């Protein structure tokens, strides 16, 4: 029910990462949600290998630096029966042959769940579960240049999303608020982008940028 949530303060979230020049955001969104649920489970925050996902999760539907889905990622961790740590399987920003090594697994998952397409459900799910993997229309130059404040983009689509990110919670602006409410969104473009890597994004403004059209998370 909370009028504010920040999972970064409860220890759920790793420091901002950078996918570099590789369409692997689906993989940073996925590890982000898996890092969170692994923490809820064990009380241990261990950073997870995106390269593992990029290299190995093709059989689940993912296409490396050419793109992918978070759901596919969670499916691979299940099928595979583990995922390697960031330390053991470092990120390289390019597609290589699979080097997974069951000895270095530090996370598991058991399925995933998809939140229905409602900023109400997505409010619930943040509050209940953990950080949530979501997809957004990021394909505007205002998103490139974003520095601070609450992101709103008139030409944003709620149906055509192109970029996976992580909702680590939500707030509001103005000691009150209809307005101005924001989602708290961790990106994977390095800390130099946005607000040290994060972005506040319009919440309950008609599913802005489709932040709720494709939400999900891993069961553990
Ligand atoms: C993941 O789960 C499988 C089967 O439940 C188990 O064999 C494996 O040891 C687990 N790995 C970790 C790192 O928890």
From Swiss-Prot:
Disulfide pattern: 22-65, 56-98, 156-209
The organism's place on the tree of life at top rank: Eukaryota
Entry binding sites for Zn(2+) 1: 9
Glycosylation-annotated residues: 108
Binding-site list for Zn(2+) 2: 50, 86
Binding annotation for Zn(2+) 6: 160
Positions that bind Zn(2+) 7: 162
Catalytic center residues: 25, 163, 187
Binding locations of Zn(2+) 3: 71, 114
Residues involved in Zn(2+) 5 binding: 137, 140
Positions annotated as propeptide: 176-178
Annotated binding of Zn(2+) 4, by residue: 92, 96
Name of the protein this chain belongs to: Cathepsin L
Organism of provenance: Homo sapiens (Human)
